[PDB]
Amino acid sequence: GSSGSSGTGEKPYKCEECGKGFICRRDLYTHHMVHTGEKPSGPSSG
Ligand SMILES: [Zn+2]
Structure with a gap:
């Protein structure tokens, strides 16, 4: 998909x-x- 060229x-x-x-x-x-420790409790707001 994504553009792939030399x-x-x-x-x-x-x-x-x-x-x-x-x-x-x-x-x-x-x-x-650092990815296996998300923080759904904060201002992250997505
Ligand atoms: Zn990463």
Whole structure:
């Protein structure tokens, strides 16, 4: 779907939660931690 053409470099593993690119699949997962702790109780208001 999304536009995909040869040009700029894109990380092989990107967070599907926020959209952070990483050169290592391991690192990405680690960051996923901050995602497993949502805060539905705050001004977040979505
Ligand atoms: Zn993320």
